[PDB]
Amino acid sequence: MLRVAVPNKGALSEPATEILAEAGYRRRTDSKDLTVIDPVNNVEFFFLRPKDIAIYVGSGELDFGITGRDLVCDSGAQVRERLALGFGSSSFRYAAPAGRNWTTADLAGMRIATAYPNLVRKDLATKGIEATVIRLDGAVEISVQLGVADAIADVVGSGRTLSQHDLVAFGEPLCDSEAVLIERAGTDGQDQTEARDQLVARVQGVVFGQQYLMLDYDCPRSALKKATAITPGLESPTIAPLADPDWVAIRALVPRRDVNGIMDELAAIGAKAILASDIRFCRF
Amino acid sequence: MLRVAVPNKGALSEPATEILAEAGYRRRTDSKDLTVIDPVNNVEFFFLRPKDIAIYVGSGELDFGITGRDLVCDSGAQVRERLALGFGSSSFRYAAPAGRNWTTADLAGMRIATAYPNLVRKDLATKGIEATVIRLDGAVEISVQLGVADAIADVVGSGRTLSQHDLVAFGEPLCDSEAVLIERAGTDGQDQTEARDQLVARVQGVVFGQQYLMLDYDCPRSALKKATAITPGLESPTIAPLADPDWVAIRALVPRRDVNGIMDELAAIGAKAILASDIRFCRF
Amino acid sequence: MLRVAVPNKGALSEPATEILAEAGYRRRTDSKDLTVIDPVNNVEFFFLRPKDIAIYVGSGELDFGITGRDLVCDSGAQVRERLALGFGSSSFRYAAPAGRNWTTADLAGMRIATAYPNLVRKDLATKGIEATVIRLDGAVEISVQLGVADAIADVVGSGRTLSQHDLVAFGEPLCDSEAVLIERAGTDGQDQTEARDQLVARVQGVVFGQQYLMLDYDCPRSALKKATAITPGLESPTIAPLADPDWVAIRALVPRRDVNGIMDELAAIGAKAILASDIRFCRF
Amino acid sequence: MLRVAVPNKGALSEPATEILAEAGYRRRTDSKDLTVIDPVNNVEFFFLRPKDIAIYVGSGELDFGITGRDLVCDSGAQVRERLALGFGSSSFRYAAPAGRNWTTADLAGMRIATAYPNLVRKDLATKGIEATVIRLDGAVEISVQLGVADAIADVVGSGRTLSQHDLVAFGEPLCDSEAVLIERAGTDGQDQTEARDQLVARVQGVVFGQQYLMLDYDCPRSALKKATAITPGLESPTIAPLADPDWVAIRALVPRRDVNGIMDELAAIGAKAILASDIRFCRF
Amino acid sequence: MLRVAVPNKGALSEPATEILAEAGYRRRTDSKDLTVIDPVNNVEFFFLRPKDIAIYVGSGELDFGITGRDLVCDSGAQVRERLALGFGSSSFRYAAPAGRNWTTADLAGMRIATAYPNLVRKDLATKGIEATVIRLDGAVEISVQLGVADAIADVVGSGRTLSQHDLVAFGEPLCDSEAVLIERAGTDGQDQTEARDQLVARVQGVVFGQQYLMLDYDCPRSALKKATAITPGLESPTIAPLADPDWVAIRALVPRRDVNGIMDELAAIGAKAILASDIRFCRF
Amino acid sequence: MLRVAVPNKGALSEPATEILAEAGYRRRTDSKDLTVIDPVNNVEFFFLRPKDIAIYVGSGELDFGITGRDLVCDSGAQVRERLALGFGSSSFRYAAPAGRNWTTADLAGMRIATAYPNLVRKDLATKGIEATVIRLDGAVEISVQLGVADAIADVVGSGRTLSQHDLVAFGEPLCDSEAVLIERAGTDGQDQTEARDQLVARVQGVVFGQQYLMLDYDCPRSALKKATAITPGLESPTIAPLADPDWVAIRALVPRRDVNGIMDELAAIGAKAILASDIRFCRF
Numbered sequence A, B, C, D, E, F: 001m002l003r004v005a006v007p008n009k010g011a012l013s014e015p016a017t018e019i020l021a022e023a024g025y026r027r028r029t030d031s032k033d034l035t036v037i038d039p040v041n042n043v044e045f046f047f048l049r050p051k052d053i054a055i056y057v058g059s060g061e062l063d064f065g066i067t068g069r070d071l072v073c074d075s076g077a078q079v080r081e082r083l084a085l086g087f088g089s090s091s092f093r094y095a096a097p098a099g100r101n102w103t104t105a106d107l108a109g110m111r112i113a114t115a116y117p118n119l120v121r122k123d124l125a126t127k128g129i130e131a132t133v134i135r136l137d138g139a140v141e142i143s144v145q146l147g148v149a150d151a152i153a154d155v156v157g158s159g160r161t162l163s164q165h166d167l168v169a170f171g172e173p174l175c176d177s178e179a180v181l182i183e184r185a186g187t188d189g190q191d192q193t194e195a196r197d198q199l200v201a202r203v204q205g206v207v208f209g210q211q212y213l214m215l216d217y218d219c220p221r222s223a224l225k226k227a228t229a230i231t232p233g234l235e236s237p238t239i240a241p242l243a244d245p246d247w248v249a250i251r252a253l254v255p256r257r258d259v260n261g262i263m264d265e266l267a268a269i270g271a272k273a274i275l276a277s278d279i280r281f282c283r284f
């Protein structure tokens, strides 16, 4: 029996449930209750505060959690990052009032407000800089106008929050917010290593599969050699005859980020009815 | 022209609309209005109170409805259950205050509160027991604390509601809450038998299809004989050559509940890029 | 870099985002902010008032928009309609109090209330009729009861709004509400013609693909000649052997509106496990 | 310790909480939980389904409830109606399809759908009429179109629901929906009679007070005799001098429904600064 | 029977209903339906789009409406403004991109976007300036960035919307957004003049009363002469004895905006228990 | 110009805005924006995270804030508590799994989870006990079941959260959650001492006034001496004649918690029309 911690609210909650569903786990019956028991898969899911998930995995009984990479950097927990999940990512920056040409060295002896004080204190220490780091519970950007701090450190999205308070980011970026699957450190006893390996392989199938599309298309046999070079697939393309003997159908996996260039090339050699379909799971 | 009753709210409403959409019927334009006319399929959908749907099919002009099996047991309507739809199921139990070792025979002459009084009265009669059954409109669990009844009878999910009121279930379970497609009894006149048969076949295609996944995978020809035994499919697996002549691609339907064991076996004989896809409709 | 205007609310908003997602564009991160930048596709999406989108494309810097055909008729903008998108369509009618046998000629010299005054004034002019057209901001049906107008002109859905105010539609219908992709008129400079052509081809792939389903089915070889005539596909059906040598699997695109007749015919010649799957993109 | 049942949702819920607050009882801390304990007043409030409240008072341990008068007529409970609360009232009527001149005698042997079957069966019996009364859970108006019943019986507001289904009300009205304070029948033991009397007196203070306004106004002494006749108050008006010796200020309770006529009369005899204030509690 | 138009949504809707309630009219039973009939006061209220209310009063059968003063300036309707209601007010300004020193004369021949084109065209004409005014449906501030206009004209609150798009207001302000009670022009026939006068007097009682508070306080008789000068009231203060013969209680209306200075002065001459209460209606 | 911090969400937010409104400050225009400027009172209100308000007052530029007393204990800020506001109060307790007879001394060397780690660490130190205090972001009760802690420390309301996780509170209570007005420590410069004193006096007027009701009642002169003893008021009751010379009207402040006993006594000596009204502000 495995126990898995899932974010109960915020930007990571829906895509976390989505990826767990595509790996074949029971979806949350209703957003009101806070556990979901999966008897067929032998897993129980707990919906918890995002900022706490790393502590639950690292000091508690949870085998796995899904949380942001910055929240693991801030927690001080000793957990293993098994997979980057491909969503939720965003930079983490120092920021200060526009129009003063701030640089990292200006932070020495200043007051820096953040919701991630342990992350920031370790970053400054590595750079050899001492400052006064002030923990706040949320929305730190207004703390400069209101006199609590000289600079801040926070997740930045597209900079909307910074510009709305006349702040400019500076310095080298910190530990980012990408969603990760974390695992409790420790070997335990074989029979539990196996159940843990199974969950990781299943989530990995979604993480990998979601990077590709399946292309299906009709192709003249005369253009078949060129098509094979254009879509080599993961092993080699599938080739099947059509009723018309001068034609075949070709099936091949292609990366999402390559798809439109690939289709233009296929169209130019005579390919017709070029179909593209979502992949949600693939065990390579 | 067929008329079909659909639950307008509650746990059965979204999965009911989902299954009707996958059978190819027009989805509800907006959740505010209460009918949806499907001119191409020649069907009209009415969104009604769940507890009333069985009466509308059994005494009204509706040809079909989707409701819970317990609501058909409680209604006294004479309708045909054509299909179990595979969602919404839950046990229906007697329950009484924890710590008293209640058994079914203790109900004789007691006061039993329930939202399904006809269901309960028929269950007790079959067992030869007489008691006083008290109809309530909803949420019956609090009626024991408040002195209206000695025991209750209600749908139980995972027992959250019972434990939150210090109640323990006992006795043989009653008619459960699984969602069913019900049909009005009666033969009418041939031309309407045909239209009715068509809807049932279409919903049955979703009910059946949703129990499987399509597996696609690349396979060495040397492992082909073993693969065929591992995934026999519904008739026999599809086999197509890859460009590489030592390899093929195999397609086969497999039951959802079998999928992960099947993939482990395929991986161990040399299969690569094992893909798994949702099935939403299959006419066997 | 392309700029595309998307309806920010109303009946057209979700299906507009849906079609853009299926063409492979970044979906709106959250419904609160009003732009979405797509760096990989080199497109920026702006979420605007539906009634304004035609003016933004026709007089502004936007390259494309998605809006209703009636809103283009009302705007007076000079834009190109590139594609009908297949949703949101509804008739646009004159309407007047029930029980008076209104005809189009009765409008001469009357007061007509509408949210689309330029559309209505051009329609009347073409028919040679002069009347007083009164602009209102919304919900015009009540304006007759309240004495502001003698008749109205409005989008009609299924006539719910008309019957709820005792109004009956009459006359030839006007410019309808179907969703369209519009483009700014003008040739600019080659390098921008190409980027524009790419977006249109991608949306066209969704518009075309969404009219079909992929049929997959197992078929006895003895029935193969008949099956080929029943499902000719877009080019010709794919044919692949099963393990069992007396059988094959057939793949073919078929129109959504044909699917159930097609399956009945296939069942009657011996086809088994007839599968039907959504198509979301097809470049013919 | 008293236990009081309060409607947990619907049209009666907010005005019920409002009247209990004005009688000085602790207001519901948050709409999520379902009890509120009032330690200073020695009362506990339970928020329950409206249709069940009469059964909880009549067969349970609750001392009081607030519910509709029709729900008491339908419940069959033996409870005392202590006060009409002055909100929620509405007529209860038979109704049938427009354009057929239905009368009460046409109901004999017909099918009548209603959410209040016991109320309707007793009403028909008193009139000497036999019919088939069909219990439904809610929204009964559509049951005629859908073939379940020939006529209905339901609360009517302003007839919106009737006209929206082409129904016309007929016959003598039934037990109406006005909100009432009900009490469990029975004398118990003196010390509990006293606590019960206290709650009734406190709610009665709100019921009575809410029918009046306090008028305050400045008045010339020369017009004082006429003013006294215009506002006699509940006992006799309060009269106090102003600094200016030719003037006084007058205070008097007047009925809400009389207020504007009263003010016109006072203005015409020389009264100035006529103030009118809400009364929320008055023990006569 | 009077008909009154009330804003159905937006910033003016709740305070409009609030002021009508304090004048003693029936409050909207539920926000879903769109009329409210007041049988005791002989008035019917219609909840309409704010931008349309002036047209309904000026060309329709409505006797009164509540809307913004700018919406009357934009409508071109011939209505009487009877009262300023004391809420909803905000300036209406031209605005253009920051950092260019725009002045009113720079508008000549430019493109100006606004939701109030008739208001703007009349303002420019009075100043002798010709420009191209572009009607938009809402949120006009983004139209400059997007190339549709050179400048805008819009209601400004505290400038949040302007600064969020880098716009600066300039020039003389236009017709503002303060809420007003408007009346249809025309004398009709005596018996309807009277009913109209009554509504205006009742709303005026709220408009006037809401500018004051009632002060009540205990005062030594030795300080009575000074107190009388500090709170003269609307006519002269009320003076009543306390049980203690060296003391009195004083009652007087004072303006809300004066209240705190007044209390400081009273405290400094020996006044105790200085009470201050809301006034919701006063007929002077 | 004063700056005041107000809770932006949670149980303290609405009653905080309510008390500020009754002291005569501008109410939040809309819950979306996060500042409100009051030009007439010369105060600006900032709506912030509750857990941060003490830090904003203690280290920032804010003059005042409203927050929970426990949040001040947890913050470590050096602020002055000027007033207890009379809402939001609740006990703060250690808690551990039911059925083990936990006492305070059992905490030595254990793991204690809490959202208020500084509060807990100072409480344990004062008692001479060392333990490991684990910071969590919220909802700490589940941390025992999930293995992160042996005991917790949290605000308890009525114990719903404790019993829902099988926890029992024990030990002496900690710093409670009552809402307080806090002020920045420091004298600054006279002209700002005065503006600060004014706000405190105004909030104090609400805090004091809200503990009383105004009683108004008609009284026979023969019972006047007894009535004066029953309602002495804050100074002495107001006495004014009625028109009827055998009667008077009496006005007196009485404590809310005394009101019903007081009215029973007045009724028994002949008092009639006993009226009771809310007090929202009183400067003693």
Ligand SMILES: N[C@@H](Cc1c[nH]c[nH+]1)C(=O)O
Pocket: A232, A233, A234, A235, A236, A237, A238, A251, A252, A253, B216, B217, B218, B242, B249, B272, B273, B274, B275
């Ligand atoms: N043979 C193709 C398609 C495929 C992958 N898996 C199964 N089929 C490829 O290797 O990409």
Ligand SMILES: N[C@@H](Cc1c[nH]c[nH+]1)C(=O)O
Pocket: B232, B233, B234, B235, B236, B237, B238, B251, B252, B253, C216, C217, C218, C242, C249, C272, C273, C274, C275
């Ligand atoms: N031939 C495989 C896959 C398939 C089913 N239907 C069409 N193809 C099977 O029978 O399972």
Ligand SMILES: N[C@@H](Cc1c[nH]c[nH+]1)C(=O)O
Pocket: A216, A217, A218, A242, A249, A272, A273, A274, A275, C232, C233, C234, C235, C236, C237, C238, C251, C252, C253
């Ligand atoms: N060969 C089939 C199926 C197919 C289309 N595209 C790829 N395969 C057809 O032409 O319809």
Ligand SMILES: N[C@@H](Cc1c[nH]c[nH+]1)C(=O)O
Pocket: D232, D233, D234, D235, D236, D237, D238, D251, D252, D253, F216, F217, F218, F242, F249, F272, F273, F274, F275
């Ligand atoms: N004396 C007035 C006002 C009043 C009632 N109660 C107290 N004062 C009346 O009897 O109506």
Ligand SMILES: N[C@@H](Cc1c[nH]c[nH+]1)C(=O)O
Pocket: D216, D217, D218, D242, D249, D272, D273, D274, D275, E232, E233, E234, E235, E236, E237, E238, E251, E252, E253
């Ligand atoms: N006499 C005081 C209070 C009052 C007004 N109206 C009635 N009483 C004044 O004139 O202001």
Ligand SMILES: N[C@@H](Cc1c[nH]c[nH+]1)C(=O)O
Pocket: E216, E217, E218, E242, E249, E272, E273, E274, E275, F232, F233, F234, F235, F236, F237, F238, F251, F252, F253
């Ligand atoms: N004189 C009464 C009522 C009152 C207070 N303030 C003004 N009037 C009292 O002192 O309680």
